[PDB]
Specification:
homohexamer; mainly alpha; Human Immunodeficiency Virus Type 1 Capsid Protein; Non-ribosomal Peptide Synthetase Peptidyl Carrier Protein, Chain A; 2 domains; 10 helices
C-alpha cells in the first residue's frame, strides 16, 4: 500500500503476505455475507490500483462477484469520462496526464503512473476512487446475495426474541439501500411480523419504544 | 488512530490489521461478556470517529447490540445539541465550526474535520467522547445480556467456595452500576444466600471481616 | 531480497523464514490454481536469482510440473543468447561482464555477481526478468493442469446464476490468454450456454448489458 | 508501556495486542499457579498505571482474585498516605503534585499525570510500584488457591523420585514465603517424608548431600 | 548467522527462533523427502559451524540420518587433512591458524575462531563447506530411506497420467545422482514402463517429444 | 537478553514473550528428552542471570527438576569461591566488585550489577557461566532421565533395521558422558545386540564399517 515515512513523504510498500492470506481466508469462510464489506476496506486501507487488483484476483469461489467489481469500474468509467473529459496536450515536468476510464480500470495504467497519483500536491485519491466503486460493487452484492427477504422473516410459536431480531437485522444489515429506507422496513415489519400475544406487548409499549426496551419488555 | 510523532505533533496512522482481526475475534468468542468494555477501550485507544465506526461495522454476529449503541448515540447526540448550541457565523483561518449531534454521530463529519478535532490548542477530545457513549451503550448491553439474576445465585449442597464466588459476582459484575450499589447488594445477599452450616461460620466472622477470612475459614 | 536502506543504496537481506513457509504452504493447499500466479510475484517482490531458485526447490509435489518451468526457462534463456550476444573483452573496475542464458539460469552465476546486477547505475532488472519467465511457465502449468474447458461449462436446470459465473470465469482465468481472447469467449459462450427461459431474459437485455445488470435481471 | 526512543527520551507506546491476547490466554490456561507471577511482571515490563489496570480488567472471570487484589492494593495504598504525606502548595512549571493512595490506585490520576511520573529527572518509578503490590496481592491468591500442603506430600510405595521432587516443590512454590522459610521446610519434610528403604539411603548420604546427589543415590 | 551490517562489515547475529522452530517442524512433517535438501540450505543460509551443529541437535527421530551427517563429515574431514596439511608455526597479529578435520567438525573450534573464518580478506567460506558435506550426507539418507525403486514404478490398468509421472519421478528425486544418470533412467523406464495402448501413443510421438507433448497425446 | 546496538555498545532488551511461551511449551511437549539441551541454549542465547532465572521458574512438568540446577549452581559456587577468592577493598569508578558464589546464583546480585557484567572491557561472560552450569545439569538430567539402558536394547525377531537403531542410538543420545565413552558402547552392543541372521552379515562387513554401509547390504 502507500504509508507515510519518517520524512513525511508518501512511499509505497510491498503488499504484506499476512493480508493476502486473510484476504482469501475471509472469502473462504464468510463467502459473501454482510461482514465482508468492512473487511474489504480495512485490509485494503491505502491499497493501490494493482494492490486492489491483486486482492480481486485472490477470492475462492464467486467469480461472477469477483469480476462484478471489475465490470462496476467499467460501467462507472463511462460517467468518469462523461464528467471528466481528459484534455489533449503535452504533460508538464512535475505534472501527470489526466486519468480516464481505462486508466482507472488498471489495464492501461503502470504502477509508476499510479504511484504519483496518490503522491501529488494536492494528491488525487485514485486509490480511494476504486475503493468506493469496489465497496459499492460489494455493497450491492451483499443485499443481492441475501437468500432471505424482509417480508419472509416471521416470529415462530416457541422461539426466543434474541434470535428473532438476530435474523430480523441479519437480512436488514444485508439488504443495504438508504438509512431512512432501512428504518421504513423496521416500522412496518419489525412489530408487524410478531406473535399473537407478543404483538400487543410491543403495541402497548408505543412507537417511541427503544429496541432494548422492547427486548426487556418481551424478556422470557 | 492518533499517536504523537517525533516532532511532538499529533499525526494520524492507518488502523493496524492486528487490531481489526482481534476486534472481531474477541466478539466472535466472548460475544458480550463483562470484560468487553475494557477491550473496547484498550485496542481503540486514540481511535478517531471513523476508526470506532469501522470497528462497530465489523462485529462477528450479535447485530442486535451494535445498532443499539447507535440509538443511544443519537439519544446522547440530542443532549449535546441541548447543552452546546452551535452558534452561526463564519469559521476562522485557524479555527473550526462547532460540532453537534450529527457531527459526533459520524454521518455529517469528514475524516479531515475530525483530524483537526483531536489536533487543536487546546484539542477538544471528541475521540474519547464517542468511547464514553460506546462504553455506556455497551455497559447496558452487558447487564442485559447477563442470563442470571443476583437474587437467583445460591450456594449448592456440595459445591466448592472457589466456584461459589465465581458465579456469585458473575451477574453482579455483569450488571454494571454504581460502586456503592454493588456493595449494597453484596452486603445483604452472599451472606444471606449461603449454606446451613456455612452461614453461621461467615456470621461468626463478623460484618467487618474481609473476604480472605471468609474464604480461609470455609476452606475445604 | 533487495530492499533500499536509509542511505538510499540497494542492500541485500536474508530471505525471511515466514515467506519460505508460506511459499510451500500456498503450493500445499492451492497446488496449481489461477490464484497462485499473483502470489508467485507478491512474496517474491525484489527476490534475487537464488531467492527465486530456492522458492522453486520447495514446491511440494508436482514432480512433472516443477521441471516444466525449467524446460520453458531454458527455451527462453536461449532467446537472450540470440538477442543479446555477450561481446568478448576485459571487465572494467566499476562494470560487470554481460549476462547470457546460463548466467540468467542461475547455474553459472554467483550471488555476488547477481548482487551488483540489481545495484547498478542504471541497474539491469535481472531479478524481475526471471519472474516474467517463471510466471509465463506457471501460466502453461495452470492451463495444462486445467480439468475444465470453456466449451463444457453449461447452466444447470436448477442451479443459481451466482455459481454459474463463478465456474464460467474460473476456467476462463485458468486458461491464461490475451484479454481480447477472453472477451471473445465471453460473447459466444456466456449468453450462448444458458437455460431455455434464462437465455431469452439475457437476450432481451441486449449485448450492451453489464454483468451486474444480467445478474440482477436473473435474480432469483 | 514506556520505552526509550532514539532521542534518549522516555516516550509512551500503545499497548500491543500480542501481549493483551497472551495476558488473558495465560490466565485462561494457568489460571492462578506459581508460574503466573513471573509472567505478570514480564509482559507488563514498563507498563503504566492504566496498562496494569487494563490487564486486570481484561481478566475474563476469576473475580475472587480480582476483588482480593483491590482489597490488598487499597490496604497497601493507605501505607503511602501514612509514609508520604503530600504537602499542600502550588505546582511548579516543570514539576508535578505529590501522589497519594487514590493517585497510585488509578481512579484519581489521568494518563498524562502518570506519563510525566516515569519521565522525570529523577523519574519516580510509579509503574514498578504497582507491580510489587500486584505481584504481592497475587502471591497470597496463589497461596489461597493451593490445594496441597507441604505436610501432605509423602513418597508413594511404587512412585519415581523425579515425581516426588516435582510435587515436593509444586506446593513449595505455591506457598510464597522467605527463601530461608522454604529451606526450613526442605530440611524437616524433604528427607523426613520418604519411604522405609528410601529414607536410610538419603539418611546415609548426610545433610550436606546436594539435591542431584540424592537423586543419583536413589536412581532406579 | 553472518549478515553484512551498515558499515559493510560481516557481523554475527543470534540464531532467530522462527528458523529453529521451522527446522524441527520441517523434520517433524516432511521427515526425509526430496524437498528437505533445499530446506536444509535455505534456512541455514550463512549459518556458522555451531549454527548448523545446533540445527543437527534438534532433529526429532531419524536416528541414522542425524548421526550419518557426523559420520560423513568425519570421513570428509580426513580428505581435508590429506589435501590441506596445516603447517606448524606461530600465528600472525592479523592472521589465524590453518583449520583441519577436527576444527571443521566443530569439536576443537571456538565460536570466535569460526567468527573470523567467514570475516577475513579474503574470507575462507568454512560455513558453506559444512553445508556441502551436510547436504551430501543427507543425500544418501534420502536414497537409504527410499522405499521405492525406479524399476518398480509401473503404470496401472486404470490410473491417470498425472500420477504416472508422479510415481516415476517420486523415486527419481529420492535416488540423488548425476543429472545425466537421471536422464538415462528417463529414457529406458519412462516410456518403457507404460501400458499396452499407452506405449504405442508415446512410441508414435518419437524420442524428441517433450514432457508436456507426452501428456497432451495421452490427455484423458 | 544482551544484543549489540547500532553504536557497537552492548544494551539490554526486555525478554520477548514468544520465547517465554515456547520456553514452557517445549517443556510441556518434549518434557525432558535429549532434544531439550539445544533448545535451552538457543532461546537463552545471550540471556542474563534474571533472564535465565525467569525461564528456570516457568517449567511445566517435573517441578523440582529445576531445584537440582539451582543446587548445582550453589555446588559449583563453592569451587568458584575456592578458585576465585573475592579480595576485600573499595570498588573503582569504572570497575565492579569481584563476583562470588551467591552473586553467580542470582539471589544477592541486582540487574544493574549483572548489566555491567556482560558489558565491560574485557566483559567477563557472567551470562555464559550460569548458562554452562544450567546446560551442565540439564545435560546430566537427559542421561539421568533415560528410562532404557544400553544393555537392554535388543533387536526384535520381526522388526526393521531402521527400528533396530531407532531405540539403539535413542538411549545413546540420552546417556551422555564422553565422545570416546559413547563410541565404546557402540562397539560392544551395536553389533553385539543384533539378530541371528543379522549378526552374521553385521560381522561380514568389518569392524571399521560406517553406519550407512551397515544398512546398504543389510537393506531388506
Amino acid at each position: 500500500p502507500i504509508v507515510q515515512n519518517l520524512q513525511g513523504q508518501m512511499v509505497h510498500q510491498a503488499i504484506s503476505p499476512r493480508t493476502l492470506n486473510a484476504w482469501v481466508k475471509v472469502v473462504e469462510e464468510k463467502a459473501f455475507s454482510p461482514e465482508v464489506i468492512p473487511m474489504f476496506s480495512a485490509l485494503s486501507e491505502g491499497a493501490t490500483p494493482q494492490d486492489l487488483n491483486t486482492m480481486l484476483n485472490t477470492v475462492g469461489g464467486h467469480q461472477a462477484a469477483m469480476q462484478m467489481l471489475k465490470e462496476t469500474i467499467n460501467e462507472e468509467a463511462a460517467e468518469w469520462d462523461r464528467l471528466h473529459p481528459v484534455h489533449a496536450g503535452p504533460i508538464e515536468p512535475g505534472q501527470m496526464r489526466e486519468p480516464r476510464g481505462s486508466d482507472i480500470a488498471g489495464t492501461t495504467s503502470t504502477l509508476q503512473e499510479q504511484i504519483g497519483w496518490m503522491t501529488h500536491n494536492p494528491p488525487i485519491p485514485v486509490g480511494e476512487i476504486y475503493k468506493r466503486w469496489i465497496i459499492l460493487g460489494l455493497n450491492k452484492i451483499v443485499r443481492m446475495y441475501s437468500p432471505t427477504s424482509i417480508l419472509d422473516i416471521r416470529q415462530g410459536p416457541k422461539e426466543p426474541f434474541r434470535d428473532y431480531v438476530d435474523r430480523f437485522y441479519k437480512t436488514l444489515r444485508a439488504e443495504q439501500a438508504s438509512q431512512e429506507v432501512k428504518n421504513w422496513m423496521t416500522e412496518t415489519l419489525l412489530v408487524q411480523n410478531a406473535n399473537p400475544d407478543c404483538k400487543t406487548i410491543l403495541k402497548a409499549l408505543g412507537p417511541g419504544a427503544t429496541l432494548e426496551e422492547m427486548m426487556t419488555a418481551c424478556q422470557g
